[PDB]
Each structure stands twice: as structure tokens, then as C-alpha cells.
Design an enzyme around this catalytic site. Structure first.
Site, PDB file in Angstrom:
ATOM      1  N   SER B  21       0.819  -1.206   0.000  1.00 13.89           N
ATOM      2  CA  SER B  21       0.000   0.000   0.000  1.00 13.89           C
ATOM      3  C   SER B  21       0.860   1.267   0.000  1.00 13.89           C
ATOM      4  O   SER B  21       2.055   1.211   0.294  1.00 13.89           O
ATOM      5  CB  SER B  21      -0.929   0.011   1.213  1.00 13.89           C
ATOM      6  OG  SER B  21      -0.262   0.446   2.388  1.00 13.89           O
ATOM      7  N   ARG B  22       0.232   2.409  -0.315  1.00 14.88           N
ATOM      8  CA  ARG B  22       0.851   3.734  -0.319  1.00 14.88           C
ATOM      9  C   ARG B  22      -0.051   4.636   0.503  1.00 14.88           C
ATOM     10  O   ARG B  22      -1.266   4.654   0.290  1.00 14.88           O
ATOM     11  CB  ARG B  22       1.036   4.281  -1.750  1.00 14.88           C
ATOM     12  N   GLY B  23       0.543   5.305   1.486  1.00 12.45           N
ATOM     13  CA  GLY B  23      -0.152   6.228   2.379  1.00 12.45           C
ATOM     14  C   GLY B  23       0.564   7.561   2.486  1.00 12.45           C
ATOM     15  O   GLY B  23       1.514   7.824   1.733  1.00 12.45           O
ATOM     16  N   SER B  25       2.224   8.573   5.242  1.00  8.86           N
ATOM     17  CA  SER B  25       3.435   8.190   5.985  1.00  8.86           C
ATOM     18  C   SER B  25       4.515   7.583   5.077  1.00  8.86           C
ATOM     19  O   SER B  25       5.707   7.689   5.378  1.00  8.86           O
ATOM     20  CB  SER B  25       3.078   7.200   7.087  1.00  8.86           C
ATOM     21  OG  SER B  25       1.831   7.496   7.701  1.00  8.86           O
ATOM     22  N   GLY B  26       4.075   6.956   3.986  1.00 10.01           N
ATOM     23  CA  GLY B  26       4.936   6.329   2.990  1.00 10.01           C
ATOM     24  C   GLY B  26       4.392   5.021   2.449  1.00 10.01           C
ATOM     25  O   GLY B  26       3.258   4.629   2.758  1.00 10.01           O
ATOM     26  N   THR B  27       5.191   4.354   1.606  1.00  8.38           N
ATOM     27  CA  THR B  27       4.835   3.066   1.024  1.00  8.38           C
ATOM     28  C   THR B  27       5.111   1.942   2.036  1.00  8.38           C
ATOM     29  O   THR B  27       6.078   2.002   2.795  1.00  8.38           O
ATOM     30  CB  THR B  27       5.617   2.836  -0.280  1.00  8.38           C
ATOM     31  OG1 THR B  27       5.287   3.879  -1.198  1.00  8.38           O
ATOM     32  CG2 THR B  27       5.326   1.483  -0.927  1.00  8.38           C
ATOM     33  N   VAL B  28       4.248   0.930   2.036  1.00 11.57           N
ATOM     34  CA  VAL B  28       4.423  -0.279   2.821  1.00 11.57           C
ATOM     35  C   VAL B  28       4.630  -1.427   1.821  1.00 11.57           C
ATOM     36  O   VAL B  28       3.890  -1.561   0.846  1.00 11.57           O
ATOM     37  CB  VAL B  28       3.305  -0.564   3.866  1.00 11.57           C
ATOM     38  CG1 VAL B  28       3.565  -1.876   4.619  1.00 11.57           C
ATOM     39  CG2 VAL B  28       3.182   0.593   4.864  1.00 11.57           C
ATOM     40  N   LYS B  43       8.212   0.109   5.758  1.00 11.79           N
ATOM     41  CA  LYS B  43       7.565   1.391   5.486  1.00 11.79           C
ATOM     42  C   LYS B  43       8.675   2.335   5.033  1.00 11.79           C
ATOM     43  O   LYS B  43       9.534   2.705   5.831  1.00 11.79           O
ATOM     44  CB  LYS B  43       6.795   1.944   6.699  1.00 11.79           C
ATOM     45  CG  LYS B  43       6.035   3.236   6.387  1.00 11.79           C
ATOM     46  CD  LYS B  43       5.570   3.975   7.637  1.00 11.79           C
ATOM     47  CE  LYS B  43       4.094   3.807   7.855  1.00 11.79           C
ATOM     48  NZ  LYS B  43       3.639   4.529   9.065  1.00 11.79           N
ATOM     49  N   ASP B 137      -3.849   9.750  16.410  1.00 12.93           N
ATOM     50  CA  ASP B 137      -4.236   9.346  15.057  1.00 12.93           C
ATOM     51  C   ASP B 137      -4.785   7.923  15.019  1.00 12.93           C
ATOM     52  O   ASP B 137      -4.505   7.169  14.082  1.00 12.93           O
ATOM     53  CB  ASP B 137      -3.120   9.571  14.012  1.00 12.93           C
ATOM     54  CG  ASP B 137      -3.625   9.580  12.564  1.00 12.93           C
ATOM     55  OD1 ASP B 137      -4.857   9.777  12.355  1.00 12.93           O
ATOM     56  OD2 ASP B 137      -2.801   9.351  11.645  1.00 12.93           O
TER      57      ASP B 137
HETATM   58  C1  LIG Z   1      -1.133  -7.210   5.200  1.00 15.13           C
HETATM   59  O1  LIG Z   1      -1.073  -5.782   5.076  1.00 15.13           O
HETATM   60  C2  LIG Z   1      -0.219  -5.067   5.888  1.00 15.13           C
HETATM   61  C3  LIG Z   1       0.573  -5.649   6.844  1.00 15.13           C
HETATM   62  C4  LIG Z   1       1.465  -4.886   7.643  1.00 15.13           C
HETATM   63  N1  LIG Z   1       2.222  -5.565   8.574  1.00 15.13           N
HETATM   64  C5  LIG Z   1       3.005  -4.798   9.340  1.00 15.13           C
HETATM   65  C6  LIG Z   1       3.105  -3.427   9.257  1.00 15.13           C
HETATM   66  C7  LIG Z   1       2.369  -2.720   8.314  1.00 15.13           C
HETATM   67  N2  LIG Z   1       2.434  -1.313   8.177  1.00 15.13           N
HETATM   68  C8  LIG Z   1       3.212  -0.451   8.904  1.00 15.13           C
HETATM   69  N3  LIG Z   1       2.643   0.519   9.613  1.00 15.13           N
HETATM   70  N4  LIG Z   1       3.697   1.138  10.184  1.00 15.13           N
HETATM   71  C9  LIG Z   1       4.908   0.628   9.864  1.00 15.13           C
HETATM   72  C10 LIG Z   1       6.168   1.216  10.432  1.00 15.13           C
HETATM   73  C11 LIG Z   1       4.658  -0.423   9.002  1.00 15.13           C
HETATM   74  C12 LIG Z   1       5.592  -1.340   8.305  1.00 15.13           C
HETATM   75  C13 LIG Z   1       1.508  -3.470   7.453  1.00 15.13           C
HETATM   76  C14 LIG Z   1       0.673  -2.887   6.467  1.00 15.13           C
HETATM   77  C15 LIG Z   1      -0.158  -3.682   5.709  1.00 15.13           C
HETATM   78  S1  LIG Z   1      -1.117  -2.819   4.467  1.00 15.13           S
HETATM   79  O2  LIG Z   1      -0.415  -1.592   4.222  1.00 15.13           O
HETATM   80  O3  LIG Z   1      -1.377  -3.692   3.353  1.00 15.13           O
HETATM   81  C16 LIG Z   1      -2.736  -2.366   5.179  1.00 15.13           C
HETATM   82  C17 LIG Z   1      -3.524  -3.589   5.635  1.00 15.13           C
HETATM   83  C18 LIG Z   1      -2.541  -1.444   6.368  1.00 15.13           C
HETATM   84  C19 LIG Z   1      -3.493  -1.644   4.072  1.00 15.13           C
END
Ligand SMILES: COc1cc2nccc(Nc3[nH]nc(C)c3C)c2cc1S(=O)(=O)C(C)(C)C
Ligand SMILES: COc1cc2nccc(Nc3[nH]nc(C)c3C)c2cc1S(=O)(=O)C(C)(C)C
Lengths: 282, 280
Positions: B21-23, B25-28, B43, B137
Site C-alpha cells: 500500500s501507499r499512504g 506516511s509512505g509506502t508499505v 515502510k 491518530d
Molecule cells: C497485510 O497488510 C499489511 C501488513 C502490515 N504488517 C506490518 C506493518 C504494516 N504497516 C506499517 N505501519 N507502520 C509501519 C512502520 C509499518 C511497516 C503493514 C501494512 C499492511 S497494508 O499496508 O497492506 C494495510 C492492511 C494497512 C493496508
């Protein structure tokens, strides 16, 4: 340069303190943190308590017992951790009335997580060597996921049971305490114990007689009775066990090698089987 | 005086890096650590202030370590790449569990109550730190779910030591408090128990903000909150005190937890396991 400090917990913040067990390391009690509203475990009775807290704090990882804080008071000295509701791997394997079935997917998952935990310790800078791995200090969380504990004998690469001790460690020194092939030996015995649910060297009276047998090259029995032919991936597991507990330490594999062998084995189990294995235990 | 350093992870040690995903805060992305042999999440994102924000987030995650906080595994700090490495949450977010009704037709009450309890446990821990850490948040999108649907709170970008969706924001915050997180929590509670989108019939987020500033909240009736919900009266009381117009009237997380503890004790442990297996 990112540094995290371990919280100091006042002893008076621990409510419903109840005795769990007494060991060489000290007394273990369960309690609830009055402010945090969670159940905790407390190991109590100086430098050796603080050393274990430091190791637990620095070695934080998914398969290592999570430390929550330290009790450092004149009145009391103890290590506060997350509470492991399902006790130890030792209890799961040998309490056969309490646990008549321990499904293969769960046994393989436990073996994989122990290897993942020990591999992490070995990959630290400098490497952390457990040197006292046993089924008694492989703890089990609420969903039977592994948490490795007991870092009393754990040394940075810079009494009870001897069944998990390699023969070269019997008469210690610089070389034996330095050895990076100790934990794999312990792991080989744990693997045998997990797959058989038998006490290693069950037919041997004196533990000193076990020591004599092991130094000669004798190991827990590998046959149809101890390791039935119906065990998933039996040949591969036997190969891993036998290389892991080899007389020559140089012939024992690294945890990396061990993990690369276990990964295809774990992929043959559907995710639901792990859930079904746990519900069967409740 | 016991100090733990956050490991530095070389970018080349992250194999099978795949976009998630992309938010804001940045890309995951998901990946596997080549030496540790575990699945991880990264992230990632070029500016001095932008770099400092990532380091700030990693510091907060490292310092705020607890059972209901997203576990940080390390930092990628290279000229080529800057990112935060954490445990992988295989079950995504609470937002996905509540609103993907074809994927999840049933979400048993024991599990919904356990999720609500673990969110409160996580936020309470943050509030009990020295100095207190205020999330500021909280949303269903950053309540992550592990392999056994246990809660891990993430997103410490807006988290301060004592945009996006405004539905979890208290009315006083519109024109800029230890009473913000409880408001967000009250909305999350409503959302968990109803599986409805708060203010679903509203076409503009400004109409939500105007409604909220006038003391109006997501609807509480038989349609949104059915009469068959376990401990319905107690949960409604918690929601209504949590999202009160006057911040002084909102409870502390301690009070919230003391309210939830007898509710959680009415559920046998096996019911949580059975709720999870029903999801698979
Ligand atoms: C399965 O989808 C996700 C799993 C994740 N597991 C761990 C961390 C994630 N995000 C994150 N937030 N903050 C940090 C520092 C990090 C690495 C995850 C995110 C996802 S996702 O982005 O697909 C989702 C479910 C949030 C859309
Ligand atoms: C259910 O029994 C136990 C649960 C435990 N939970 C967490 C930690 C334990 N021990 C421990 N090892 N090292 C430290 C620093 C601590 C607190 C737990 C121990 C037990 S036990 O003692 O009853 C058991 C199962 C090992 C006999």
C-alpha cells in the site's frame, strides 16, 4: 544510535502475586500490573539477575521471551516478562494425560520457531550463544507460539539435566564456552524429543551413565518404536537430528542450514491445521 | 540504565520486496529477511525533515515496545534507501475485517470484544509512559492484526510526547490534550459493534465536521446497534462517555479498562479460538 531503556517497575505495582515454580535461576510468580492491566510473570529470589534482564532486553525478537521491565528495589529484585499461559514444551510433550494428542503441524511449527529464535541469537553482533537450551525453557504463549527463555548460561561470542549437553562440554574450558556448535546439539535432542514424546535415554538409570554413553557416541534411540514410520518427513528429520548431534562438532550444521531444510517441510502444512492443533489442546 | 539499540538492516538483506500500500506516511511493502528467515514489513519513501520524521517514527516504535504495539525489527538507513522494518501482520487492518463483509460474513462477539480490549491495553500503555505518549491518530486503518487476530497499534507519525479521515477526531481538534485518543476509541468501538461506516449517509467530510461540532455523533439505535449485542447497555454507556462534547467528561483508559475487564471475563478462552477458525 536509536536506544530504548528498560522500564523500572515498582514492586507495589504487581497485584495478585502467586507462586508458579522454584528453580535454580530463582522463584517464578504470576501477577497483574496495576497500571498496565495485563498479566505478567516475575522471576525473583544481584549482577546475574541484571545480566539476564540486559540479555533479554538486547535480544528482543518474535521468538524470544519479551521482557516488560525490572524490579530493582532494596526489598525485592526481579525480572518482569509477558506471561506464557501454556507453560513449557517439556509439559506439552510429557503430560500425556493433559495432552493425549499433539498434532504434527504444531510439533513442526514449534521446531521451526525454536530454530528461528536460536538463529536470531547467533546472527546478533556479537553472536549470542544460548548454551542451556532444554524443553523446560522453550515457553509457549496463548496460541502455542514459541518464546525462548533462560539466558543465565547464555554467553556473547567475544544443577539440572545434561541430556541436551554435547559430550565436549562435560569438562569445560575456553574452547567449550566459546563453541558455536553447542546449541545445534541441544536442538537435535529437542527435535528427537518433540517427534517421539519420549524421555531421551529413558532406559538409563544414572545421569552419569548417560554421560559415559554419550562420550562413546551413543544417542537417544532412532527406531520404529521411538520414531514411528508414519511421522511426516521422517527421513529428512532423522537426517537433521543425526547431523545436529554428531560427535564431531565440525560436522553439525548451522541454524541457517537447518532453517533452509525446514522451510519446504513447513510449507506442506495448510494454515488451518495449526489452528485445529491448538483447539484440540484446549 | 539497561539500554537496547535498534539493529540496522542492510537493504540487500530484504528479499522478495513486494508493494502492499501507499499512504501519507509512505509506502508499505512485504519482504523476507535473508538471514533471519522471517517475513517482514517495510515502510519507506528526499528531504532533511522527511528523513528526520522516519527516524522519529522508528525511535517511537522502539521506545514504546509492548504486547499490543507493532514490533519494530530494525531500520534501513542507507543513501540508496530509508525505511522502517517491522513484523509482518498477515491479517491486515481492523478496517478490512469490519468492512470486507463478503470475505468475513461473521466476526464473533468474543473476538470483537478482545480486539476492543487490546486497543485499550495498547493506548493505556502509551499514556502510562514517562513522559506520556499520545497517539492522536487512532483509526481502524492503523489497528493491525497478527496471525491469530491479536492487535498491534501502528502509525506514530502524529503521536506526540506529553491529512486523511476526520471521523475519529474530537470536535475541539478542528482548530488547534490527553482526551483525544478516548474520543477516537469511542468511534472505533461504535464501528466494531455495528460494522457500519460512521456517518455513512454523509456526502462531504465538512458535513461530518459541522455535525460533530454541533454535538451529533454516529447513530445509536436498533438498526446500527442491534438489541442482541452482548453487554449492549454497558458498551453504549462507554461509547457515549468516550465521545462526549466536553473533553472533561471523557474517561481515562484506566477507567475504560476497569469497565471492559468484567465483560471480557464472561468469554471462555476457546471461544476466541473458534471465532478465528471461523474467519479462515
Ligand atoms: C497485510 O497488510 C499489511 C501488513 C502490515 N504488517 C506490518 C506493518 C504494516 N504497516 C506499517 N505501519 N507502520 C509501519 C512502520 C509499518 C511497516 C503493514 C501494512 C499492511 S497494508 O499496508 O497492506 C494495510 C492492511 C494497512 C493496508
Ligand atoms: C505457566 O507457567 C509459567 C509461565 C511463564 N511465563 C513467562 C515466563 C516464565 N519464566 C521465566 N523465565 N525467565 C524469566 C525471566 C521468567 C519470568 C514462566 C514460567 C512458568 S513456570 O515456571 O510455571 C514453568 C512452566 C517453566 C514450570
Amino acid at each position: 544510535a536509536i536506544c530504548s531503556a528498560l522500564p523500572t517497575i515498582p514492586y507495589h505495582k504487581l497485584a495478585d502475586l502467586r507462586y508458579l515454580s522454584r528453580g535454580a535461576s530463582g522463584t517464578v510468580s504470576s501477577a497483574r500490573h496495576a497500571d498496565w492491566r495485563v498479566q505478567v510473570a516475575v522471576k525473583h529470589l544481584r549482577k546475574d539477575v541484571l545480566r539476564e534482564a540486559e540479555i533479554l532486553h538486547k535480544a528482543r525478537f518474535s521468538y524470544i521471551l519479551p521482557i516488560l521491565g525490572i524490579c530493582n528495589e532494596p526489598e525485592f529484585l526481579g525480572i518482569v516478562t509477558e506471561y506464557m499461559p501454556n507453560g513449557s514444551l517439556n509439559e506439552l510433550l510429557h503430560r500425556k494425560t493433559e495432552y493425549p494428542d499433539v498434532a504434527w503441524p504444531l510439533r513442526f511449527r514449534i521446531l521451526h520457531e525454536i530454530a528461528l529464535g536460536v538463529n536470531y541469537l547467533h546472527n546478533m553482533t556479537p553472536p549470542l550463544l544460548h548454551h542451556d537450551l532444554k524443553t523446560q525453557n522453550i515457553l509457549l504463549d496463548n496460541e502455542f507460539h514459541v518464546k525462548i527463555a533462560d539466558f543465565g548460561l547464555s554467553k556473547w561470542r567475544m544443577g539440572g539435566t545434561i541430556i541436551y549437553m554435547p559430550p565436549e562440554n562435560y569438562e569445560p574450558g575456553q574452547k567449550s564456552r566459546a563453541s558455536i556448535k553447542h546449541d545445534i546439539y541441544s536442538y537435535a535432542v529437542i527435535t528427537w524429543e518433540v517427534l517421539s514424546r519420549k524421555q531421551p535415554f529413558e532406559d538409563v538409570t544414572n545421569p552419569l551413565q548417560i554421560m559415559y554413553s554419550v562420550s562413546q557416541g551413543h544417542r537417544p534411540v532412532i527406531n520404529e518404536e521411538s520414531l514411528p514410520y508414519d511421522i511426516p518427513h521422517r527421513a529428512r528429520m532423522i537426517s537433521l537430528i543425526e547431523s545436529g548431534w554428531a560427535q564431531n562438532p565440525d560436522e553439525r550444521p548451522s541454524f541457517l542450514k537447518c532453517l533452509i531444510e525446514l522451510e519446504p517441510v513447513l510449507r506442506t502444512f495448510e494454515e488451518i491445521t495449526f489452528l485445529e492443533a491448538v483447539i484440540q489442546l484446549k
